[PDB]
């Protein structure tokens, strides 16, 4: 079914992806940190891994998602301007007839 | 050829391996930074990779090598004590005999 515009529910659901990925990484890391009986150098290694993982998440997901939302705001601004122009044109065409 | 004990030359050669591995990683990182015009999150990711690589190098090479050298020092102390005991025993055996 063509839903001409994006619903608030679907935007609030689509922005959940980076949050859920970050929560997945955090839960994996918490399960890693749960084993208290652990080397310090291993913890530094795991910290480096966690940093690179979230850097990948931001480079591949959050960044492009935010860029798409900015581009869509530009598209929406242009479309609103054109539709306001068309509304004024139709209002002028119909109003003077009476 | 059975070389009963360690020459200093071989220790000075064995300690060059961690240096060469660290230098290899460092040269990789330096050649990575040549295209300075690069994303910042990507540079954080590459820094994390460098840190994880050196953490692995220390966990798998430098650490076990240092443990081996400490174990060898303990072995040499025990062996020195045993050989001193044996030297005293042979000194007594040759003094009392003829």
Curated annotation (Swiss-Prot), chains A, B:
Instruction: List residues modified as Phosphoserine.
Output: 40
Per the record, the domain of life is Eukaryota
Q: Where in the cell is it found?
A: Nucleus; Cytoplasm; Cytoplasm, Cytoskeleton, Spindle pole
Q: State the signal peptide span.
A: none
Q: How does it assemble?
A: Component of the ARISC complex, at least composed of UIMC1/RAP80, ABRAXAS1, BRCC3/BRCC36, BABAM2 and BABAM1/NBA1. Component of the BRCA1-A complex, at least composed of BRCA1, BARD1, UIMC1/RAP80, ABRAXAS1, BRCC3/BRCC36, BABAM2 and BABAM1/NBA1. In the BRCA1-A complex, interacts directly with ABRAXAS1 and BABAM2. Component of the BRISC complex, at least composed of ABRAXAS2, BRCC3/BRCC36, BABAM2 and BABAM1/NBA1. Identified in a complex with SHMT2 and the other subunits of the BRISC complex. In the BRISC complex, interacts directly with ABRAXAS2. Identified in a complex with ABRAXAS2 and NUMA1.
By sequence similarity, the record places it as follows: Belongs to the peptidase M67A family. BRCC36 subfamily.
> What is this protein for, i.e. what is its function?
Metalloprotease that specifically cleaves 'Lys-63'-linked polyubiquitin chains. Does not have activity toward 'Lys-48'-linked polyubiquitin chains. Component of the BRCA1-A complex, a complex that specifically recognizes 'Lys-63'-linked ubiquitinated histones H2A and H2AX at DNA lesions sites, leading to target the BRCA1-BARD1 heterodimer to sites of DNA damage at double-strand breaks (DSBs). In the BRCA1-A complex, it specifically removes 'Lys-63'-linked ubiquitin on histones H2A and H2AX, antagonizing the RNF8-dependent ubiquitination at double-strand breaks (DSBs).
Protein name, please?
Lys-63-specific deubiquitinase BRCC36
Origin organism lineage: Eukaryota, Metazoa, Chordata, Craniata, Vertebrata
This protein's gene is called Brcc3
State the covered range within the intact protein: 194 to 291 of 291
């Amino acid at each position: 079914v063509p839903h001409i515009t994006i619903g608030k529910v679907c935007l609030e659901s689509a922005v959940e992806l980076p949050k859920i990925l970050c929560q997945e990484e955090q839960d994996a890391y918490r399960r890693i940190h749960s084993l208290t009986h652990l080397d310090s150098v291993t913890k530094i290694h795991n910290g480096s891994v966690f940093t690179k993982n979230l850097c990948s998440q931001m480079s591949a997901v959050s960044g492009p998602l935010l860029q798409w939302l900015e581009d869509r705001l530009e598209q929406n601004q242009q479309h609103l301007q054109e539709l306001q122009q068309e509304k004024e044109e139709l209002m002028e065409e119909l109003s003077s007839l009476e």
